[PDB]
Paper text:
[name] syncytial virus (RSV) is a nonsegmented, negative strand RNA virus (NSV) that causes lethal lower respiratory tract infections and continues to pose health threats to infants, the elderly, and people with compromised immune systems worldwide. The RSV genome encodes the [name] (N) that forms helical assembly to encapsulate and protect the RNA genome from degradation, and to serve as a template for transcription and replication. N consists of 391 amino acids with N-terminal domain (NTD) (residues 36–253) and C-terminal domain (CTD) (residues 254–360), which is one of the most abundant proteins that forms the helical assembly with viral RNAs to provide protection from degradation and to participate in transcription and replication as the template. The RSV-N protein consists of the N-terminal lobe and the C-terminal lobe linked by L14 that is conserved among all negative strand RNA viruses.
We prepared the RSV nucleocapsid assembly by recombinant expression of the full-length N in HEK293 cells. Final three-dimensional (3D) reconstruction yielded the RSV nucleocapsid of roughly one left-handed helical turn of 10 N protomers at 3.96 Å resolution, with the top view resembling the decameric ring architecture as reported in previous crystal structure. Modeling of individual N resembled the previous crystal structure with well resolved density for protein side chains and RNA bases and similar secondary structure. All nucleotides were modeled as uridine due to the random composition of cellular RNA, with each N bound to 7-nt RNA. In our nucleocapsid-like assembly structure, we observed seven nucleotides encapsulated in the overall positively charged cleft of each N protomer, with four bases facing outward and three facing inward. The positively charged residues K170, R184 and R185 in N-terminal lobe form electrostatic interactions with the phosphate backbone of the nucleotides pointing inward, whereas S313, T315 and Y337 in C-terminal lobe form hydrogen bonds with the phosphate backbone of the nucleotides pointing outward to the solvent. We observed that Y88 in β3 and D221 in α7 of N interact with R234 in L13 of N + 1 via hydrogen bond and salt bridge, validating the key role of R234 in interaction interface. In addition, we identified interactions between Q26 in L2 of N and Y38 in α2 of N + 1 through hydrogen bond as predicted by previous study. The absence of Y38 phosphorylation in our structure suggests that viral transcription and replication likely utilize less compact nucleocapsid template.
Residue numbers in the entry:
A (entry chain A), B (entry chain D), C (entry chain B), D (entry chain C), E (entry chain E): 1 to 362
Write the structure that this text describes.
RNA sequence: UUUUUUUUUUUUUUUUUUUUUUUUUUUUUUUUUUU
């Protein structure tokens, strides 16, 4: 009857507001960050292969190198386009290949290097020298190495970006907490690669990536759109296939409570007949409809500092949050989720109901 | 049938009337309030950092200083634009950096200061001296301070503006009543900051802000639009993140009764079958439609002296107001809302119904 | 079918007729009523403050003084404009500040006074003397008065105009009947002001205002447009905000029956199925449409002698009027509305239905 | 299809014909009827006040006197203009104030009188003498009379013109039939006036007015336009409002059948499905459209001998007239309307239907 | 498509033809018919009053006398103008008042008479003598007669012209057939006049008028334009309104079939789907458009011998005429219209349909 | 060929207004596991 139209869609109104605000704040530093093109991908892959075959190398700039691989795989104009869509005021320090001369210990030698505002030909040739030394050492004691053991093979950048995906998985919390689980998974898979190569320091690579993402954030959006584009394609090697599964596994972070609530719904937890949640039913329905409307680009918000993610938190609905938490904990799956309820009574009640309901499960 | 068009939209008619009145009253004082630009933000941030690291400093002009930070972050032309939209007759006393000479206790020293019609180089250098003294004292007994303990770090203005948001939350009542809850929340959060710095007098900062807002009101609109613009952006630090959540938490003040009425609706309180509210159903529906039409810019009205807010008060609908109050109190959530009903009988009846309905909740 | 166009819009035809009549009657007295400008507002506010702080003063010309405050706040040209729109033939006796010399009891003293065709410097200095005497008396027995206790504060004219709004509320009846309710409300609010000052004689002020409005009517339109303009603004204090709520509360006088009819509609009173009102349905619909078309400037008609208000009276529809009256009385809200129905049977029937319907209200 | 344009608008054709006839008949008597101006209004009001305060005076020329008041309130040029628009051949015997000398019973006294072609200074001084005598008698037995009891007050002419409006109400029939209802309505109100003054002979005033309107007709148009102009104004008193309501109540005389037909339509009387009225539907629609087109100046036709009023009579549509009559009589509101139907069967049928439909009205 | 322009407007072509024929036939008798002016109207009215008050007078020349009254009311120049527009070759025998001497039975007496080429002073004085005799007889047996019983009153000519209008009503047939209905109506009205006077022989007056119109036709056009001019005026009495209504009632004679066809259309007679009338639809539409174009001066054609009236006869459309006749007769309103159809089958069919449709009328 | 009957219009009731009433007032950052 007439009551049905008594409503208030504060969420939609906030959305409209933040979408149309008429004003803007600016930093506009004016940086001149680099951007390569399709050409130097081969040199970069060879470099990553050297840095992989070499043992115990200081995997410091590895995350940077992988981001450069990504930008080269993408394209100058496309990178610039997404950056301008993101709203930046930066420039394109074009990259250029060149030879470097160095009288190494009484020998003039040619050295393939790239001009950059962040790299140094010194460390480049150091890397190349160490790779050459341990590579000839590897040639010793067997006579020859396979093609799948040398820097020339093409899967190196994808191997690094797999770890990058493992890190962007847990960057939601992003406090160097999930490093242990990251290492655990990276050893659970990639065993073939860990035996085929040796310059694999997962902890060091992850720390490097953490530093990179903590300082320069725009690489986040870069890597995101790169992974999305790579997934949409159907081409690539075995590593590219695993990479896509890993990347997509990190969909929908900072949104777990919604799915757990759907879970407790599908289990038919009795406690939802309580008036204290039957009230909030309306608003929770409305936010669910909002998420359904947004559809695709919904899971990657909390990855970023996108301000519209705060809407999708049921922490403001304490009774609902607490009952869902109690249900999931009674199911014995909330391993170490450092959350908290509000109505401890409802939490304990739902937990007791669930554990009672499971043991007598036919 | 024919009865459906018997209507009278007094609210819309009042809206049209006040929108088009043909006349205006003016004060037009002719003040020459200052306005900085993007340049001096660094000096101001350093100043706020000094005033933060220093202990037990008289946080008197801190609210003013934060407003100056805000105007500098915004822009001269934008501030002037919003002021003219607000309908002011003021001028732009441009700010200028300069050095000040002072033979401090037998030593001529240079002193970074800004010409202003509100500030004094004397108190500026006093602040700087006190900061330097306690900073070298902090350098004692440890040997060195971290970069996150010195005035040079960039989060100071945002730290102050967080408290500013906590204050504009309760400025709706605006009688220095919510100061206790403000302090409570400011200690519930910002514990990291309270340990990282020491010049934190929340009560004093809040009193300063109260004085500032009580005297000069235009800073209200300034701070509002500033927070809105900052929220719409996404590029920010952790402090900028917390600030946006805090600011948005103060959306929709002086409108709580609408949401509580929606609550009592969603609970299906039996008492709304009463004819004495079935009558007023029409007008309450109409005002709800008006609010839905206005959409976004609806919650910030009561923050201001905007005259159109008086429409959105259901106090003129006594039966509806009383039943909603009784329902919410029966739910045991109306903590200390100093309201009053009219039909005490309906109030008590709804409260009894609700408390009866909760205890037997399955 | 063809019957739908059988119609007769006597209301619209009367409207057109009275709008275009080709002739006019004139009085054209040729008065020289005064008009100040923005300058003397401060002196007038100080005068009102004196007349407020002084005790038991004969609040005789207070309504006149408040109207002068209003004209000064408005502007000479604007007052003249609205008067010419109202169709007057008066002149502008310009006001001028000056000093007056008077050897008070052996002392020559200067006296701030304004030349006027209504005021006298004698009574002006009498007021000032009494204010000074009781002000120094107030300074006794405490040592000092606060700034919010002296004539210098700026809220005096608004304080008077609040009572003016309370009076123009009930001026529709305008027979000195609502004075009791006026006093009741004026004591229900303004308690802070009644304790902060003492020259508050609400009955005397109201009688003064009644005399003023009974004699000079043009001040009615003046005060109306003044209140409208003040409400549209936002820059104001507590008193200014209260004033606007009070003024707007008097919207739509002599039109209560329409809203009560809407009420009885929303309650679905069974008696409207009667043919004796199903007939008049058409004309009542038409007048409702006329009111909806006029929209804003509809509620202030009965305040004035505007001749077009007689249309908006359902007294000519006796059956409808009587049923609405009976319904509202059965709801027990028609307190003392000295009205009368025509069909006493329908009146009693609707009342019985309503009271039957309320007691069994679920 | 093609049938829709088979039409014949005899009404419009008659209208065009009578509007353009090329010829004219003339009487052109050449009278020299008087016309005053704004000056003598005060003397005339004093005279009417004398004739009101005096008891049992022969209210013979009172209607004439009121018409003179009206012409004085209007203006010489305006009266002449409307008369020439009406198509007269008369002159303007200008009025002039003067003193008259008369040795009353051994005393020479001055007597304010006006030269006129219809008045006599003798009867003027007789009136003044009688007023003076009973006025001093009224001064006896109380000591003093109020200002609202003497001839000097300004509402006398309006008091007379109220009765004039009551008479022009029923002048449509204009056979001295409605005198009883007129007296009843003069006692329904004006009770305050009947107690405040005593020279009130409603029957005598009405007979005087009847004589005046029966002889001189042009005063009809005069009084009409006067009332219209007075209504359009707003500046007035209680008597002025009363008068306007009374005057407008006489709008639309000799047109009641149209409104009663609209009534029977809005009730949905079943009998209109009869073919014998479905036929005449077209012409009745056409005349209704004609009336809607004329709009405003439609109700005052039957007041005059304007020849175009005969169009707006549904007596020529016997079936429609009879069914409407039967419906209205079945509603029990056609009190004493001395009409007649044609199809007595349809009349009785509709009456039976209506009375059947009312008693079972839910 | 192309077929729409296949047309033939024989009616318009005949109209153009008869309008422009280039030739003329003439009689040009050269008569010297009289014409009075405004002066003798009073004498003529007195004469008619004598001839009315006198009993059983031979109302032989009464129609002539009334026509002379009409010409006197019109004007010499205007009569001559309309006659020349009608295309006559006559002269103006001016009328002149004079006294006649006659030694009546031994008494020389003065006798008011007018020189005329049709009248005789002998019969004039005979009329006057008879009037005087029966007038003094009327003075007997009551003592005095009222002013509304003597020849001096002014309504006599209008009283005669009312009967003249009743006759010109039925002159369309003009075979002394409608005399009975004429007498019936003349007794249905004018009862007041029939009791107030006695020289009223309606049959004799009508026979006189028939003779006059049968012999001299130009008086027809005279009387027509006179009635039209009198109707357009408004300044009149009861007899004038009566006369105008009567005159206008005779509008549109010899055109009844058009209106009856419109009637049968508005009833939606099924038989018009027949192809035999769907064919003639075009031409009947065209003549209807022609009549609509002519507009006003359309109804008075058949009154005259104007040759253009033969167009407006649907007798040449036999199927349409017969179906309309059958419809109207089935409605039971074609009382005694001595017409005839052509398609008797269609006539009977439509009649049966109509009478079937009426009895079952809801 | 054409035309073809019926008929003046008006008629009752009635000024309008009339009550109650400033609004605000509470709590709250969000994220956190497994593949």
């Amino acid at each position: 009857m007439a009551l049905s139209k008594v409503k208030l869609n504060d969420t939609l109104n906030k959305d409209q507001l933040l979408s149309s605000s008429k004003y803007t704040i600016q930093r506009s530093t004016g940086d001149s960050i680099d951007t390569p093109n399709y050409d130097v991908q081969k040199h970069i892959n060879k470099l990553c292969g050297m840095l992989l075959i070499t043992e115990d190398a200081n995997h410091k700039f590895t995350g940077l190198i992988g981001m450069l691989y990504a930008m080269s795989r993408l394209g100058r104009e496309d990178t610039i386009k997404i950056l301008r869509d993101a709203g930046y005021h930066v420039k394109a320090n074009g990259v250029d290949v060149t030879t470097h001369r160095q009288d190494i210990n009484g020998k003039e030698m040619k050295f393939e290097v790239l001009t950059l505002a962040s790299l140094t030909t010194e460390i480049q040739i150091n890397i190349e020298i160490e790779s050459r030394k341990s590579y000839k050492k590897m040639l010793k004691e067997m006579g020859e190495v396979a093609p799948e053991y040398r820097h020339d093979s093409p899967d190196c950048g994808m191997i690094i970006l797999c770890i990058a995906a493992l890190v962007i998985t847990k960057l939601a919390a992003g406090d160097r907490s999930g490093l242990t689980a990251v290492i655990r998974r990276a050893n659970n898979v990639l065993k073939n690669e860990m035996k085929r190569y040796k310059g694999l320091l997962p902890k060091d690579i992850a720390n490097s990536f953490y530093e990179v993402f903590e300082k320069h954030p725009h690489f986040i959006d870069v890597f995101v759109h790169f992974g999305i584009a790579q997934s949409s394609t159907r081409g690539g090697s075995r590593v590219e296939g695993i990479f896509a599964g890993l990347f997509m596994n990190a969909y929908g972070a900072g949104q777990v409570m919604l799915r757990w609530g759907v879970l407790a719904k599908s289990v038919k937890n009795i406690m939802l007949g309580h008036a204290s949640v039957q009230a909030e039913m309306e608003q929770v329905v409305e936010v669910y409809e909002y998420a359904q409307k947004l559809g695709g680009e919904a899971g990657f918000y909390h990855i970023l500092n996108n301000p519209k993610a705060s809407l999708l938190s049921l922490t403001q609905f304490p009774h609902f949050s607490s009952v869902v938490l109690g249900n999931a904990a009674g199911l014995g799956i909330m391993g170490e989720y450092r959350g908290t309820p509000r109505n401890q009574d409802l939490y304990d009640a739902a937990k007791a109901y669930a554990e009672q309901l499971k043991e007598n499960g036919v």
